Design a protein around this nucleic acid. Structure first.
Ligand code: MG
Ligand code: MG
Ligand code: MG
Ligand code: MG
Ligand code: MG
Ligand code: MG
Ligand code: MG
Ligand code: MG
Ligand code: MG
Ligand code: MG
Ligand code: MG
Ligand code: MG
Ligand code: MG
Ligand code: MG
Ligand code: MG
Ligand code: MG
Ligand code: MG
Ligand code: MG
Ligand code: MG
Ligand code: MG
Ligand code: MG
Ligand code: MG
Ligand code: MG
Ligand code: MG
Ligand code: MG
Ligand code: MG
Ligand code: MG
Ligand code: MG
Ligand code: MG
Ligand code: MG
Ligand code: MG
Ligand code: MG
Ligand code: MG
Ligand code: MG
Ligand code: MG
Ligand code: MG
Ligand code: MG
Ligand code: MG
Ligand code: MG
Ligand code: MG
Ligand code: MG
Ligand code: MG
Ligand code: MG
Ligand code: MG
Ligand code: MG
Ligand code: MG
Ligand code: MG
Ligand code: MG
Lengths: 64, 52, 76, 51
RNA sequence: CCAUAGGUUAAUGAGGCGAACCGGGGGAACUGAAACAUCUAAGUACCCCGAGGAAAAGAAAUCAACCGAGAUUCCCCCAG
RNA sequence: UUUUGUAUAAUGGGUCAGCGACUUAUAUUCUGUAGCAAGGUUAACCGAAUAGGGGAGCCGAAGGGAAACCGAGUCUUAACU
RNA sequence: AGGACCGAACCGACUAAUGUUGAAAAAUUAGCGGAUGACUUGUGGCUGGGGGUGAAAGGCCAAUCAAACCGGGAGAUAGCU
RNA sequence: GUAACGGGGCUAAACCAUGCACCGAAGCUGCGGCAGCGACGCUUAUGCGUUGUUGGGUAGGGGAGCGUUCUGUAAGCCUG
RNA sequence: GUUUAUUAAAAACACAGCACUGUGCAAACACGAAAGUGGACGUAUACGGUGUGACGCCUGCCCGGUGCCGGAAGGUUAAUU
RNA sequence: AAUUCCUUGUCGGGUAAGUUCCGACCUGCACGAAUGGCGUAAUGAUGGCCAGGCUGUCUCCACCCGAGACUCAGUGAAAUUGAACUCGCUGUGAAGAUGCAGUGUACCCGCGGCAAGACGGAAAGACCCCGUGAACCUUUACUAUAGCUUGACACUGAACAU
RNA sequence: CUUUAAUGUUUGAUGUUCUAACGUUGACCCGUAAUCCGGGUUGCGGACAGUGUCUGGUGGGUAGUUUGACUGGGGCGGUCU
RNA sequence: GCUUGACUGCGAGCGUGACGGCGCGAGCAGGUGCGAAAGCAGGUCAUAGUGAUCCGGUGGUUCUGAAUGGAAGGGCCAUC
């Protein structure tokens, strides 16, 4: 049968041009006020998936 | 922790606000500060409000 | 017992030594209190972290009445 | 062809090592298992919508 | 009291068996979730009823999207 | 066989013969190889039928952004050297 | 008269020896308790598995019982050997 | 059961200090053989006085093979 | 008297007796999706449940906790509107 | 004390000597009144203790009668078993050696016996621990649920009085 | 607007009296050779009881499960950022 | 004494982590405060004062709006 994508990972990672995956930074949901503005500002932009986790992401996302 | 978080709402009506904390035992008077408003790109007076 | 506690080591110390070429903004040493003081072309962070304000070679020197240790960057 | 004698180089274990999950019949953890922690695709928050 | 229930005849028909497939009435747990309740397993196993050579479904109070298509069933896509 | 470590007084086997354990399907990624090549390839099905037809689709040649959108740029921001 | 007494059949099974791949997957030998009773026994019948039945030990329910046996789910699962 | 030189035995066959020998390993060196790899000389998918060097091995990774049954080759070939 | 058939026959269980409590008979209760049946073709001098366990002398104090019974004014409170 | 930890409590009786028994004492670690208290004739394959009789239970075993064991003939198993050309000692060593080192001893092979060893045989240890094992059972563990109970609506209507 | 006196209305709260739903494991008749059932007559009860949906309370009666790890074995103690 | 830089958008280059992440940062843009100015200020001498994701709540937003116009809901920003 067709492989089923892990739907939780498909809603958080988008494939990029050179095969990478972008995700939003964590730690920015509901305890952010006590965090310095500089810390919050750096978490706002999108980030690249680290090399260690590339294999796990590709396994969860076989069709994308 | 007994200090409670508050929000400072801009008077310009943009709806932007900052958040901070204040001691409720002392300093009952409302907090007024001049802070930068990103919507109007100017430093305006921010007024204390209730987080909800 | 009521002991057996510690915190993870914060990896302080000298990261770039004398004569090393560094890029602007690279931190040379992380410390607790001003063990080293900022000299020419060297900035001081809010936690007394000394960082390079220009490209060049790291040089350590001792000057002043207090016999203190200073870090400067010779930007060629 | 593993497990077909000493000379084959894959005998008596079939390349699976010694008594792990990979050595059990039908053994092995599911995709995204991080040893017990919630995996990275669950530590991180969801974002966006599909148009 | 008529009636009705009931009773006695006479005609037809049905009874049971049989592999799977089919429709319907009921309907688990082990297991997976590295535990476990929602969930999964699964409307599966099993039980029951009924029918046929097929059954079921079926001739739009259906879809489309401002263009149109024109009952149902089945296959490949759409698409993990 | 299991172990840091077994002549070990740790497990296994009385012996022989026969049998006895990494397979299969689908999908996906990588390598090798062959073909074609900015293109490649069809599935069901049709078909005297391993041919041929069928390009329905799928992947690739363009990305950025949550998205609308823009596009060799794009997002972020009022704007970015 | 008696859930009276002594004591065979009958029924029980307290002690000891033997037997422990037995004559016997619970018995034999010598003693022992009850022996007109809440006794014992024959032939039929009824109660069915989360149920039965139990003068109650988790006992018994076909040499199996803190949940019988048979088939099915089923190649349950087994981070263990 | 001697059992605290392995034993015999030793007054040096012990210890100390100098020497010169010898024994001693699958180490090293000779004389052959096989294989992997590196840069060369010509030639190089082949290979050549090549040369230098390497070749203990579990888990495990890589590479190259043997043999068994069956299909084509094969209405061929082997065989009273 | 009964009990762990097959290592325990006992001080364990049962027992007559005693007390509490439920039950007015389409009884309580129990087995049953239900019908029904048992209780019982019985009727509180009866039946069920619980604890104690002949007989003799006796069974003292605590209703705060937890249950049960009685009360219903007030507080709180579901479906519904 | 079926209850007493300290404990063989203390005293008395029984004995030559009694951690048991019997009688008291009370200091009841931690008895107690129908989860009954205390007594109680009779009963008991009931528990403990004592005395007489009686005896091979014993001092201390002896003999004898039978059935096996032993020999012969016939029939003819079993558990177990890596392979054995299967000695002692001391030391070493997966840390208790028939198998290693050293050394001593020992002609080859049966039969009747004894069980010290072969960590002898039996049965993937019941104790201990572990597994995000199983099962039963308990409860003011969690979530439910049968049952019981409450009300609204329906089956279900009329009239009158407040 | 308050205070509201009366006025009809619309919903409820009880109490009383009916019968016609419903109940009858009261009597009698028939089906009928019948302690079932059904029908009829009559009496009693009666808008209750009882049942359905929804709903609050109760509920080891019965289920499905949970009940951590480190640790000079484990538990207990301590610890977990 | 005067004040709100306990500023908004960003950030060359580094540090420390398996990762999630955490930390340091000159400089740039817009607006500020204190100084006459050079200049300093992106909280506190520094290192503890803390909690991921999911789900739900609040405000903002021409991002989306299942035929169309809205809307619900979702997204983004701020935040519980
Ligand atoms: Mg190998
Ligand atoms: Mg193994
Ligand atoms: Mg392994
Ligand atoms: Mg599970
Ligand atoms: Mg036919
Ligand atoms: Mg052995
Ligand atoms: Mg064996
Ligand atoms: Mg290829
Ligand atoms: Mg074709
Ligand atoms: Mg096309
Ligand atoms: Mg760009
Ligand atoms: Mg008698
Ligand atoms: Mg007798
Ligand atoms: Mg014996
Ligand atoms: Mg008697
Ligand atoms: Mg049995
Ligand atoms: Mg069971
Ligand atoms: Mg079975
Ligand atoms: Mg199954
Ligand atoms: Mg199995
Ligand atoms: Mg060599
Ligand atoms: Mg053939
Ligand atoms: Mg017995
Ligand atoms: Mg018996
Ligand atoms: Mg017995
Ligand atoms: Mg009793
Ligand atoms: Mg009370
Ligand atoms: Mg009271
Ligand atoms: Mg004692
Ligand atoms: Mg005495
Ligand atoms: Mg006494
Ligand atoms: Mg007592
Ligand atoms: Mg009392
Ligand atoms: Mg009492
Ligand atoms: Mg008796
Ligand atoms: Mg006695
Ligand atoms: Mg005597
Ligand atoms: Mg031997
Ligand atoms: Mg020995
Ligand atoms: Mg020894
Ligand atoms: Mg012998
Ligand atoms: Mg012997
Ligand atoms: Mg013996
Ligand atoms: Mg555990
Ligand atoms: Mg339970
Ligand atoms: Mg389960
Ligand atoms: Mg533990
Ligand atoms: Mg719509």
């Amino acid at each position: 049968p067709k492989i089923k994508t892990v739907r939780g990972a498909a809603k958080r990672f988008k494939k990029t041009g050179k095969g990478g995956f972008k995700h939003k930074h964590a730690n920015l949901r509901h305890i952010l006020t006590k965090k310095a503005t500089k810390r919050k500002r750096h978490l706002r932009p999108k980030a690249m998936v680290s090399k260690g986790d590339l294999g796990l992401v590709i396994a969860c996302l076989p069709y994308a | 922790g007994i200090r409670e978080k508050i929000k400072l709402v801009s008077s310009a009506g943009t709806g932007h606000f900052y958040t901070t904390t204040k001691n409720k035992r002392t300093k009952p008077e409302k907090l007024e500060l001049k802070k930068f408003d990103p919507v109007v790109r100017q430093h305006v007076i921010y007024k204390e409000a209730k987080i909800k | 017992t009521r002991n057996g506690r510690d915190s993870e080591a914060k990896r302080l110390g000298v990261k770039r030594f004398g004569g090393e070429s560094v890029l602007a903004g690279s931190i040379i040493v992380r410390q607790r209190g001003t063990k080293f003081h900022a000299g020419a072309n060297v900035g001081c962070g809010r936690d007394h972290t000394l960082f390079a304000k220009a490209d060049g070679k790291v040089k350590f020197e001792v000057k002043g009445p207090k016999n203190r240790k200073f870090i400067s960057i010779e930007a060629e | 062809r593993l497990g077909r004698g000493i000379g084959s180089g894959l005998g008596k274990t079939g390349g699976r090592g010694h008594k792990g999950q990979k050595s059990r019949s039908g053994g092995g953890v599911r995709r995204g298992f991080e040893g017990g922690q919630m995996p990275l695709y669950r530590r991180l928050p969801k974002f966006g919508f599909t148009s």
